[PDB]
Write a protein that binds this ligand. Structure first.
Ligand code: HEA
Ligand SMILES: CCCCC/C=C\C/C=C/C/C=C\C/C=C\CCCC(=O)O[C@H](COC(=O)CCCCCCCCCCCCCCCCC)COP(=O)(O)OCCN
Ligand SMILES: CCCCC/C=C/C/C=C/CCCCCCCC(=O)O[C@H](COC(=O)CCCCCCCCCCCCCCC)COP(=O)(O)OCC[N+](C)(C)C
Ligand SMILES: CCCCCC/C=C\CCCCCCCCCC(=O)O[C@H](COC(=O)CCCCCCCCCCCCCCC)COP(=O)(O)OC[C@@H](O)CO
Ligand SMILES: CCCCCCCCCCO[C@@H]1O[C@H](CO)[C@@H](O[C@H]2O[C@H](CO)[C@@H](O)[C@H](O)[C@H]2O)[C@H](O)[C@H]1O
Ligand code: CUA
Ligand SMILES: [Cu+2]
Ligand SMILES: [Mg+2]
Ligand code: NA
Ligand SMILES: [Zn+2]
Lengths: 79, 227, 43, 58, 259, 49, 84, 105, 73, 144, 46, 98, 514
């Protein structure tokens, strides 16, 4: 749709120095999308943008901790 | 980096650093002038045997000495805030790099495309190679493309640190649980140094930052070779 | 201000003694620690 | 109950040079000594505890 | 002989004993937290209690029994008490600031929502509303006590003050019971931290104000107060209104708005 | 009557100045302090790589 | 807002006693009924070992170090879940 | 408010008061030297004659010293004021500080 | 002999003050001029001159040949 | 004459050029001849001798204006003593260097500094004004 | 009452200048030496 | 609704508090709670300064609203003058049984 | 008699003298810590150990100079001695509670010296930020002892502040309005209102830190939904007002000392000086986040804190120009106290102006956490609060003691200290602009020259501090007793003689209304 992805674009929802919620919201959006896909039988490739953005923005250790907690059943955000 | 006997700021490597130097020059003249005026007026009040010790009326003179300072402050604040809103303006980065502070070293993550990350530690003084700078060099430099807008995102995995590079005008604190953003754009290739800038325990003096600014195609091949 | 002459004048020699003892009281204990630092550290 | 404030007024105003904290009589002296002995004793004890805690235990 | 109206106080050991009790309580909390021992702390709590008792005893001796509280002395003590309440209001403001900072911007660890994921707040219409009625009622009954005292009515002063103290105690027992029953604890992240530290300092101040009203109750039983001179009672009524207003802000902020 | 300053002022000024200059020059030049001045106009650059 | 109540023209103790028994204590009695009515145990929620809860960065200075000060076995799980 | 002439006239009248007392003489000179001026000859003349009515020769001399002092480094002011006072100095037999050696340090 | 002329006697401190505050202002202007010229303007011109024909690839090549970089030999 | 500590609440004498007429006379007790001179002062001052006028002045006042305003040599003592103690400080610093400081790092050895200087020039440290700007990359020497 | 006057409104004696010098030396001297001995203590420990 | 049992200050104030309440009832001010009103301050009509000893400090606010107060000891004897404005004060010593 | 007089005091002079002795002793501790700092930095490499021991020393230096030297001397020592005498009051309103403010300080100091003795000390900086100050990176008792030391010092000053406010409002002569009290009394009242409102906020923040370290709360721990940055706001909501608390009583002493040695009856523009101190006290509560310009706050918040911080230059400038207008036309007496006050006027102005530089957030990005901040605040603290303290101590020492200092020695002491503090701090501006960070035990080699000079400066100031102890000994050894003092009609604190009797104003002054 919009390949040649370089990095995450400016997002007017998160215009300030603190970008923590940008990473978090994209991580959520990705995982929500992926659940909505696969579930309804459709294709996870439509969630790809959120995946690229959270990968770009989020520290590896945050992603890794959140992934562990989703596996353990202790992820506190709603997916 | 700083050089011996240096008096002022490191030379500007970025346009926003250039702006800060001219705004510092403007502000320092003011500082110079007010301090000199005060020292001079002091010597003027103290160098005569003539006296006038009876009550003196204050209202006229207090207007001058409120209004002129107010005007001088507005003449500092106008360019100060222009620069503040400039750094904040939207600029479209081509790359995002994260750095995480640790006790006591920085790690870097370049994860726009591949999973590239590594640790960056001070070279111990007994291992410096001849010509290298004590407490400043690192084993793995933060290689970046010159002449491009880069988003740096800064955090910490333990205590506070702060990620600074004076010649680019940069200092962003590294706070665990928070992701702070800044932008970086070097006008020139080369090696640009900084040092951890928030007290963080036994080796705070010894976890420096070295950026290595090179043409895009060199940065890409270096990125690929670091996987 | 005006004041009376000293009730117990402190001559130049007595001032030399007070000054020296006062400087030694700061210099000697700190000097002893800093002289022995290498002993404390590479202990 | 009856109002015996006038009796306390005479007691506390008696011209015996006693400071107010001991003017009630010998029970004030006792409670004063008990308080000051626990404070000074506890303070020596807190110093002992600093000396103890100032060195590793290992 | 002085010919001003102010009180030159006799030399006193209680400032030194109270200062040493503070050293003993703090070095005691240190030994409790880090060296597994309650000894210093119990000695400091004891000396602190002995110090307050004798110091305020002596202020009663100086005033009711010796007559040193002229109007200029009382007016100082009014300022003193007002300023002390102001400093306690600022101390609570730092905890309210902590509460709003964390709840207005809940971080990802909490689930990015308030109350955090996994927290089940108390229902504010149950025991917390009951506690609100209890402290508001006790601000009505102390005001009755105050007017009976000014009107010279000993029996209704004592009756209204007893009611006011009984409501303070009821709030303190209802709170102790809600702490026991609460399914979250002080270790339940910033929700349990702000909840228990802010309501817990408030409960301590309810215990302090109730103690102070009990002191006034026994002085009243001993006839110390006149219908025009009773600053200890006014101070404890101002401190009691302070504790009720802090509760109202906690109820609205933490129990209600933060549920 | 001349006071302390009339009798000793000149000597105190002369000797304190001589002593101050002498001991600062010595401390600054004779005991191995590394002031780390600028290399500019002073150091000949040497091959490092 | 006057409230809906309504007086002055004299003053004092008698009015505040009227307010204490006519309005304030009735309100307490009412809230006390309301409360002691929604009282008695509610079903404890499934235990989930969420990492932002049951914090332990240093043992508590009492008990076994792992119980909160007014721990209620019925409704306060430990970091490893409700007690046996 | 007032002209220089009115300022001077009020001071002349202050010191010309026949039964001026010692306290008023000191109050007047110690207030006057607080101003940013050296007092005109006619003010000093009236203060010197007040000294005479109060039989105080020393304070006449001290008044002349304080005129010189209020001139600061304007060394032309004092010799001009003494020149203008000479008839009064001669009439009252007031010696100047210099004629008494009281200018010597 | 000749009389001495009457000198100014009044407002001497105020006059000295007026004269020197104006002096101090004039100096501040003449310093501001020199400071704009020796420091600020000089800096603007050093940066404008440096970048006018600056070739960043050529600067990079010199650094690279001097062996300074990790990423480029 | 003799000022006492227990006279603090009484008007007192002071020499200062801005309070020329102090609240009491310098000398209030008079000898037989000094009483006769105060009587003589009630008559024409032209009949007082110069010594009598100076004696009246010194009864009323302690020091003249020229005495009380005189300059002193105190500055020599202050500046000289301050330089002494500044000089003494350099003794402490010599002692510290000799007995407290060890060798500084090897990066300050002359050959290290030469090499580091070339490497700073090779990376064009501060090439606009501060450092490399002062090096002539064409003549390979420091700019004049 | 208490003593009043120069040298009497202080908790230390100034009756003898030398004994005063000793006490002042112990007093200021102990405050200045303490952080060196604490540093020595922190180095010795480990 | 009401009854008695609370002592009044008249019955129970004591010590200095009682002295002050009893003097105020007589219009008197032995403990200096009120500011004295100035006379015209001339030598015929000086401000009269009570004292229990032989001297008392006066502060003179020479004109209304001056922020500077002029302080001096006033001694028993002849009226003295404020050294800034000259208004006259005279000490009237004695007793504390005024 | 001794214990009744000196441990059980209810007397404002004696308790003032206790605070002066305690503050002088603290000052020798803070001076030793400052020389350990400058010995570590005085040549390249490591002298003492790594940054732990070094920042234990830096952290204790600041707490001792602020809480145990400057606040006790200015407010406990000069405030207790002078305020009651300057309003004709017989003592403070709460003379017994006043003695507890004093006695809580030796235990607060003991806790701070315990913190440095146990474990590895609290190497946190005087701001005590978490998580470095929390129970994982600073495990064990040191930081809790520092928290408790701050609680005791906080209670001592909060009760002090209640006492000064009450005394100043309630115990003036009935004719004196607050606009007839001297400027030093206004400066203590304002400073005490700042203490009353700011200390309880620090007490709340450091209590939160205590419970995060010992009760498993998570106010500042993101794992529980907390935020380290919240601690910074609570701390600096107190810490900005605190620097105005450290300077305001200095401004009040400077106004008295300048007026007195200019031979004037009053300071120029009295109601302007009052307005200026209340405006600075008020503005000092709405600017705290200028200590947090690199923490990642929003741009409009950084624009508001830049502007509100700058505005404080207006009322501050009124005071500097009014001190100049007070010298104007004076009969200048070049006493050693006057020299300290003239040094204050100029060197405070220098450090206020570098503060103005730093108020600019965009520039503060590069100056923050470098020695440029260290230079700013030591010009207003070592060459402002300290110069006002040494000016007031040599000025009023003959009132408190009844004995005179030798003025020649005091001028020599002023000259050595002036050279030593400028040699020490002036070069730190260069270190900061060129990028040397704060809280470092060692620096890259390029920073050597200015650190060496700064360390040589600190030793010259050590020689001045040693000579000061001798000068005080000399005055008590020679016993030259005061006879008369100039200008008592406008300096009421001298009018009861030197030293004043134990009870003064037993009969109050007479002041009529008219
Ligand atoms: C006495 C102590 C004191 C005082 C009075 C001040 C006064 C001020 N300070 Fe300072 N400051 C400190 C002690 C003090 N400071 C300390 C301890 C720190 C660091 C804390 C830490 O991190 O540990 C600090 C840190 C600090 C910072 C944070 C910098 C950083 O960490 O990056 C800033 C930022 O704005 C600041 C600004 C100011 C300003 C604008 C003033 C102003 O109030 C100064 C106003 C005065 C003047 C401007 C001079 C007089 C005026 C005139 C002659 C009129 C003409 C002037 C103009 C037109 C400008 N200071
Ligand atoms: C109506 C309640 C009144 C309180 C009664 C309880 C005892 C302590 C009293 C003090 C209360 C003040 C607040 C101190 C902080 C914590 C206590 C908060 C209130 C409370 O009691 O919280 C309890 C935890 O107590 C705990 O940790 C207890 C830890 C107890 C140790 C206290 C720690 C010391 C605090 C130091 C205070 C310093 C203040 C300085 C003053 C500032 C100077 C200007 C809650 O229990 P929980 O099991 O976690 O959850 C309930 C589960 N069913
Ligand atoms: C950002 C930087 C800003 C820097 C601003 C600096 C401001 C400089 C201002 C200059 C003010 C000029 C005033 C000159 C005063 C000096 C002494 C003097 O000259 O004394 C008198 C001035 O006093 C008067 O009243 C007139 C006024 C009242 C008394 C005099 C005091 C005013 C002096 C203020 C001095 C300030 C000095 C330092 C400031 C930095 C002169 O006497 P007059 O003829 O008026 O008598 C007439 C009598 N009447 C009143 C009854 C009519
Ligand atoms: C769990 C417990 C441990 C924690 C410690 C705290 C414990 C509880 C203490 C409760 C407080 C009791 C106060 C009793 C004071 C009695 C003395 C008194 O009330 O004294 C009155 C003066 O008021 C005065 O000093 C007013 C005195 C003001 C008292 C201040 C009270 C609040 C202090 C509380 C400390 C707060 C801790 C903050 C915690 C974060 C006496 O003057 P009158 O009443 O006019 O009488 C005179 C008439 O008789 C003449 O006709
Ligand atoms: C004037 C009167 C005031 C002065 C009072 C002086 C009192 C001195 C007695 C202190 O000794 C005791 O020692 C206990 C046992 O030796 C300690 O228990 C501690 O000792 C062990 C090590 O932690 C553990 O077994 C315990 O649980 C732990 O609490 C604890 O510190 C204290 O009770
Ligand atoms: Cu990492 Cu400082
Ligand atoms: Cu600030
Ligand atoms: Mg920082
Ligand atoms: Na070092
Ligand atoms: Zn007057």
């Amino acid at each position: 749709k919009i390949k040649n992805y370089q990095t995450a674009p400016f997002d007017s929802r998160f215009p300030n120095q603190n970008q923590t919620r940008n990473c978090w919201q994209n991580y959520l959006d990705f995982h929500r999308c992926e659940k909505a896909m696969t579930a309804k039988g459709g294709d996870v490739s439509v969630c790809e943008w959120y995946r690229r953005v959270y990968k770009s923005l989020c520290p590896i250790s945050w992603v890794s901790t959140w992934d562990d907690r989703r596996a353990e059943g202790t992820f506190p955000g709603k997916i | 980096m700083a050089y011996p006997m240096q008096l002022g700021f490191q030379d500007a490597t970025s346009p926003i650093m250039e702006e800060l130097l001219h705004f510092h020059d403007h502000t320092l003249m003011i500082v110079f002038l007010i301090s000199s005026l005060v020292l001079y007026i002091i010597s003027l009040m103290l160098t005569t045997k003539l006296t006038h010790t009876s009550t003196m009326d204050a209202q006229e003179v207090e207007t001058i000495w409120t209004i002129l300072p107010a005007i001088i402050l507005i003449l500092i604040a106008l360019p100060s805030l222009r620069i503040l809103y400039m750094m904040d303006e939207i600029n479209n980065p081509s790359l995002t790099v994260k750095t995480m502070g640790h006790q006591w070293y920085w790690s870097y993550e370049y994860t726009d495309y591949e999973d590239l990350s590594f640790d960056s530690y001070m070279i111990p003084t007994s291992e410096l190679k001849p010509g290298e700078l004590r407490l400043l060099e690192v084993d793995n430099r933060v290689v970046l493309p010159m002449e491009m807008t880069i988003r740096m995102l800064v955090s910490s995995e333990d205590v506070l640190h702060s990620w600074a590079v004076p010649s680019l005008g940069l200092k962003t604190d590294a706070i665990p649980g928070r992701l702070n953003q800044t932008t970086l754009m070097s006008s020139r290739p080369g090696l640009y140094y900084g040092q951890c800038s928030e007290i963080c325990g036994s080796n705070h003096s010894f976890m420096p930052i070295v950026l290595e600014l090179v043409p895009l195609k060199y940065f890409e091949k270096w990125s690929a070779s670091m996987l | 201000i005006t004041a009376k002459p000293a009730k117990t004048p402190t001559s130049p020699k007595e001032q030399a003694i007070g000054l020296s003892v006062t400087f030694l009281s700061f210099l000697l204990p700190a000097g002893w620690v800093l002289y022995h630092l290498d002993n404390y550290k590479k202990s | 109950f009856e109002n015996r404030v006038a009796e306390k007024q005479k007691l506390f105003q008696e011209d015996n040079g006693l400071p107010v904290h001991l003017k009630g009589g010998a029970t004030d002296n006792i409670l004063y000594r008990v308080t000051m002995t626990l404070c000074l004793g506890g303070t020596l004890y807190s110093l002992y505890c600093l000396g103890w805690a100032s060195f590793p235990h290992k | 002989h002085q010919t001003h109206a102010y009180h030159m106080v006799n030399p006193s050991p209680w400032p030194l004993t109270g200062a040493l009790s503070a050293l003993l309580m703090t070095s005691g909390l240190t030994m409790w937290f880090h060296f597994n021992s309650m000894t210093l702390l119990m000695i400091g709590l004891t000396t602190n209690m002995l110090t307050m008792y004798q110091w305020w005893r002596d202020v009663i001796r100086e005033s009711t029994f010796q007559g040193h509280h002229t109007p200029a002395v009382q007016k100082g003590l009014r300022y003193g008490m007002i300023l002390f309440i102001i400093s306690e209001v600022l101390f609570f403001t730092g905890f309210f600031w902590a509460f709003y900072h964390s709840s207005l911007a809940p971080t990802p660890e909490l689930g990015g929502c308030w109350p955090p994921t996994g927290i089940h707040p108390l229902n504010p219409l149950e025991v917390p509303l009951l506690n609100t009625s209890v402290l508001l009622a006790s601000g009505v009954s102390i005001t009755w006590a105050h007017h009976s005292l000014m009107e010279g009515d000993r029996k209704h002063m004592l009756q209204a003050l007893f009611i006011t103290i009984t409501l303070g105690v009821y709030f303190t027992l209802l709170q102790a019971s809600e702490y026991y029953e609460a399914p979250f604890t002080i270790s339940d992240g910033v929700y349990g931290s702000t909840f228990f530290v802010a309501t817990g300092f408030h409960g301590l101040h309810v215990i302090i104000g109730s103690t102070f009203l009990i002191v006034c109750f026994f002085r009243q039983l001993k006839f110390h107060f006149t219908s025009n001179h009773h600053f200890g009672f006014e101070a404890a009524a101002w401190y009691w209104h302070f504790v009720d207003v802090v509760w109202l802000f906690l109820y609205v902020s933490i129990y209600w708005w933060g549920s | 009557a001349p006071d302390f300053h009339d009798k000793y002022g000149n000597a105190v000024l002369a000797s304190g100045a001589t002593f101050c200059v002498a001991v600062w020059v010595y401390m600054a030049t004779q005991i191995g302090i590394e002031w780390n001045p600028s290399p500019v106009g002073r150091v000949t650059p040497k091959e490092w790589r | 807002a006057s409230a809906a109540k309504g007086d002055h023209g004299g003053t004092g103790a008698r009015t505040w006693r009227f307010l204490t028994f006519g309005l304030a204590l009735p309100s307490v009695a009412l809230c006390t009924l309301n409360s002691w009515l929604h009282s008695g145990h509610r079903e404890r929620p499934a235990f989930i070992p969420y990492h932002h809860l049951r914090i332990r960065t240093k043992p508590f200075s009492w008990g076994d170090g792992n119980h909160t000060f007014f721990h209620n076995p019925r409704v306060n799980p430990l970091p490893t879940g409700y007690e046996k | 408010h007032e002209t220089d002439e009115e300022f001077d006239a009020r001071w002349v009248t202050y010191f010309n008061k026949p039964d001026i007392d010692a306290w008023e003489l000191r109050k007047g000179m110690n207030t006057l030297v607080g101003y940013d001026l050296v007092p005109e000859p006619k003010i000093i003349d009236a203060a010197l004659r007040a000294c005479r009515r109060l039989n105080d020769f020393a304070s006449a001399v001290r008044i002349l010293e304080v005129v010189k002092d209020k001139a600061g480094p304007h060394k032309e002011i004092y010799p001009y004021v003494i020149q203008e006072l000479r008839p009064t100095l001669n009439e009252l037999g007031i010696s100047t500080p210099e004629e008494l050696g009281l200018d010597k340090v | 002999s000749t009389a001495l002329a009457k000198p100014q006697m009044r407002g001497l401190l105020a006059r000295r003050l007026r004269f020197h505050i104006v002096g101090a202002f004039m100096v501040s202007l003449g310093f501001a001029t020199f400071y704009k010229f020796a420091v600020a303007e000089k800096r603007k011109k050093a940066y404008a001159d440096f970048y006018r024909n600056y070739d960043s690839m050529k600067d990079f090549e010199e650094m690279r040949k001097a062996g300074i970089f990790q990423s480029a030999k | 004459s003799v000022v006492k500590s227990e006279d603090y609440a009484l008007p007192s004498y002071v020499d200062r050029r801005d309070y020329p007429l102090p609240d009491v006379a310098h000398v209030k007790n008079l000898s037989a001849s000094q009483k006769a001179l105060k009587e003589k002062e009630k008559a024409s001052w032209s009949s007082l001798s110069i010594d009598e006028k100076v004696e009246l002045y010194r009864l009323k006042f302690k020091e003249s204006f020229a005495e009380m305003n005189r300059s002193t040599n105190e500055w020599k003592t202050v500046v000289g003593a301050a330089m002494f103690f500044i000089g003494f400080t350099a003794l402490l610093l010599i002692w510290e260097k000799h007995y407290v400081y060890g060798p500084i790092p090897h990066t300050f050895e002359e050959e290290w500094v030469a090499k580091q200087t070339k490497r700073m020039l090779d990376m064009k440290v501060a090439p606009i004004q501060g450092f490399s700007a002062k090096w002539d990359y064409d003549k390979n020497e420091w700019k004049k | 009452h208490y003593e009043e006057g120069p040298g009497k409104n202080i908790p230390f004696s100034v009756e003898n200048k030398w004994r005063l010098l000793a006490m002042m030396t112990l007093f200021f001297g102990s405050g200045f030496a303490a952080p060196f001995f604490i540093v020595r203590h922190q180095l010795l420990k480990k | 609704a009401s009854g008695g049992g609370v002592p009044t200050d008249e019955e129970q104030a004591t010590g200095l508090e009682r002295e002050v309440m009893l003097a105020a009832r007589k219009g008197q001010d032995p403990y200096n709670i009120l500011a004295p009103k100035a006379t015209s301050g001339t030598k015929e009509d000086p401000n009269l300064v009570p004292s229990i000893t032989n001297k008392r400090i006066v502060g003179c606010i020479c004109e209304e609203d001056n922020s500077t107060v002029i302080w001096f000891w006033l001694h028993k004897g002849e009226a003295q003058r404020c050294p800034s404005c000259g208004t006259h004060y005279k000490l009237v010593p004695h007793q504390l049984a005024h | 008699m001794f214990i009744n007089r000196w441990l059980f005091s209810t007397n404002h002079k004696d308790i003032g003298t206790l605070y002066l002795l305690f503050g002088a002793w603290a000052g020798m501790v803070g001076t030793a810590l400052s020389l350990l700092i400058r010995a570590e930095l005085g040549q390249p490499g490591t002298l003492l150990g790594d940054d732990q021991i070094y920042n234990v020393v830096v952290t204790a230096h600041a707490f001792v100079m602020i809480f145990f030297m400057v606040m006790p001397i200015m407010i406990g020592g000069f405030g207790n001695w002078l305020v009651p005498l300057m309003i004709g009051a017989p003592d403070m309103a709460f003379p017994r509670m006043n003695n507890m403010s004093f006695w809580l300080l030796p235990p607060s100091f003991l806790l701070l010296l315990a913190s440095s003795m146990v474990e590895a000390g609290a190497g946190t900086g005087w701001t005590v930020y978490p998580p470095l100050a929390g129970n994982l990176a600073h495990a064990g008792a040191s930081v809790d002892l520092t928290i408790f030391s701050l609680h005791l010092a906080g209670v001592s000053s909060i009760l002090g502040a209640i006492n000064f406010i009450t005394t100043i409002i309630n115990m003036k002569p009935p004719a004196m309005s607050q606009y007839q009290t001297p400027l030093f009394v206004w400066s203590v009242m304002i400073t005490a209102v700042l203490l009353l409102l700011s200390l309880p906020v620090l007490a709340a923040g450091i209590t939160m830190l205590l419970t995060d370290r010992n009760l498993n709360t998570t106010f500042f721990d993101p794992a529980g939904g907390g935020d380290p940055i919240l601690y910074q706001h609570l701390f600096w909501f107190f810490g900005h007002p605190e620097v105005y608390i450290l300077i305001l009583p200095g401004f009040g002493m400077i106004s008295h000392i300048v007026t007195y040695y200019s031979g004037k009856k009053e300071p120029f523009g009295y109601m302007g000086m009052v307005w200026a101190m209340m405006s600075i006290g008020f503005l000092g509560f709405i600017v705290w986040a200028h200590h947090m310009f690199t923490v990642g706050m929003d741009v409009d918040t950084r624009a508001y804190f830049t502007s509100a911080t700058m505005i404080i230059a207006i009322p501050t400038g009124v005071k500097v120009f009014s001190w100049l207008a007070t010298l104007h036309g004076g009969n200048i007496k070049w006493s050693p106290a006057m020299m300290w006050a003239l040094g204050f006027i100029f060197l405070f102005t220098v450090g206020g102006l570098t503060g103005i530089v730093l108020a600019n957030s965009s520039l503060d990005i590069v100056l923050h956490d470098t020695y440029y901040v260290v230079a700013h605040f030591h010009y207003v603290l070592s060459m402002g609060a300290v110069f006002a303290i040494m000016g007031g101590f040599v000025h009023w020492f003959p009132l408190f003691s009844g004995y005179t200092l030798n003025d020649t020695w005091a001028k020599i002491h002023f000259a050595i200290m002036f050279v030593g503090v400028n040699m020490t701090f002036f070069p730190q501006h260069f270190l900061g602009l060129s990028g040397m960070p704060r809280r470092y035990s060692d620096y890259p080699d390029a920073y050597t020259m200015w650190n060496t000079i700064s360390s040589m400066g600190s030793f010259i100031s050590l020689t001045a501090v040693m000579l000061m102890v001798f000068i005080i000994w000399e005055a008590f050894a020679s016993k030259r007793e005061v006879l008369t003092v100039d200008l008592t009609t406008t300096n009421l604190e001298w009018l009861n003689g030197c030293p004043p009797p134990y009870h003064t104003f037993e009969e109050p002054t007479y002041v009529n209304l008219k």
